[PDB]
Design a binder for this molecule. Structure first.
Ligand SMILES: NC(=O)c1ccc[n+]([C@@H]2O[C@H](COP(=O)([O-])OP(=O)(O)OC[C@H]3O[C@@H](n4cnc5c(N)ncnc54)[C@H](OP(=O)(O)O)[C@@H]3O)[C@@H](O)[C@H]2O)c1
Ligand SMILES: O=C(O)c1ccccn1
Ligand SMILES: O=C(O)c1ccccn1
Length: 230
C-alpha cells in the first residue's frame, strides 16, 4: 500500500492521474495538492510515501526539494530541471536513502521508440524523423524529437528538408486531430525500417508514472529517464 500525493492535481496531467490511479490497487491517493496548498504540511498529515509532480518549470526544483526534505519520494514529470539541479537532487536523495524519479517523458512507448532508434542507427546511417502534434504544441521540433536525434547522432559518431539536429533532419507536422506522434525512418539499399510511436491521449504516460511510483520505493538514489526503470 503506497500513499501517493498528486501535486498539480488541477492541471491537465494531474486530472488524468487522478482518474487512473483509482484502479491501481497497490496505490492510494491520499491527497491532491495545488498551487496554494502547503505541500510539506500535506506530506506530514497524510504520511505520504510518494509525490507525483506535474506543475511548472518555475516550481519544479523547489517542489522536489520540499518533497525530499519532508521524507517522501518525488516522481517528477514536470519539465524544467537543469543538470546541476538533478545532480544536487541525487546527492540529497542518497544522503537520506530516499528514491526519486525524474522522467522528461513518462510514455513507455516513446522511450522504447527512442531506445530502438538509437540501436538501429548503428546499422542504418541514413535516417530522418517525422513528428506530428496537435497545434497546441508550440515548440517545433518537439523535445522528444530533439532527444531522439541526439541519441542517434551519438551512436553514429561513436527548406522542405527539415531542421537538422545533431545531423538528423526532423520534420514537424502540426494539425488538429493529432496528439503526439513520432516516426523514425531508417533507409538502406532496398528497404526501410520505421519505429513509430502514437500517443493517443494523456493516458499514454500512465503505465510509466505508476511504474515509477512502485520502483521509487525500492530505490535509495535518483533515477533520471524512464528508460532506466525498464
Ligand atoms: N514528463 C512527461 O511525460 C510530461 C507529460 C506531460 C506534461 N509534462 C510536463 O508536466 C508539467 C505539467 O503539464 P500540464 O499539461 O499538466 O500543465 P498544466 O495544465 O498547466 O497544469 C499545471 C498544474 O500545476 C499547478 N501548479 C502551478 N504551480 C504550482 C505549485 N507551485 N505547486 C503545486 N501546483 C502548481 C497549476 O495550478 P493552477 O491551475 O492554479 O494554475 C496547474 O494545475 C509541464 O511542465 C509539462 O511540460 C511532462
Ligand atoms: O531523455 C531526455 O532528456 C528527453 C526525453 C524526451 C524529451 C525530452 N528530453
Ligand atoms: O500535452 C502534451 O503535449 C502531451 C501530454 C502527454 C503526453 C504527450 N504529450
Amino acid at each position: 500500500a503506497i500513499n501517493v500525493i498528486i501535486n498539480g492535481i488541477n492541471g491537465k496531467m494531474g486530472r488524468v492521474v487522478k482518474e487512473n490511479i483509482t484502479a491501481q490497487s497497490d496505490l492510494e491517493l491520499v491527497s491532491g495538492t495545488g498551487r496554494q496548498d502547503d505541500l510539506a504540511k500535506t506530506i506530514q498529515t497524510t504520511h505520504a510515501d510518494v509525490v507525483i509532480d506535474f506543475t511548472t518549470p518555475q516550481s519544479v526544483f523547489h517542489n522536489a526539494e520540499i518533497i525530499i526534505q519532508s521524507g517522501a519520494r518525488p516522481v517528477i514529470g514536470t519539465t524544467g530541471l537543469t543538470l546541476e539541479q538533478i545532480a544536487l537532487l541525487d546527492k540529497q536523495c542518497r544522503n537520506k536513502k530516499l528514491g526519486a524519479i525524474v522522467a522528461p517523458n513518462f510514455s513507455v512507448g516513446a522511450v522504447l521508440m527512442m531506445k530502438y532508434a538509437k540501436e538501429a542507427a548503428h546499422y542504418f546511417p541514413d535516417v530522418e524523423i517525422i513528428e506530428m502534434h496537435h497545434s497546441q504544441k508550440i515548440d517545433a521540433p518537439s523535445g522528444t524529437a530533439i532527444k531522439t536525434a541526439q541519441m542517434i547522432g551519438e551512436m553514429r559518431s561513436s527548406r522542405a528538408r527539415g531542421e537538422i539536429k545533431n545531423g538528423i533532419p526532423i520534420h514537424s507536422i502540426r494539425l488538429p486531430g493529432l496528439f503526439s506522434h513520432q516516426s523514425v525512418i531508417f533507409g538502406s539499399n532496398g528497404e526501410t525500417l520505421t519505429i513509430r510511436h502514437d500517443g493517443m491521449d494523456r493516458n499514454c504516460t500512465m503505465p510509466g508514472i505508476f511504474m515509477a511510483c512502485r520502483k521509487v520505493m525500492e530505490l535509495d538514489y535518483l533515477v533520471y529517464g524512464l528508460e532506466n526503470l525498464l
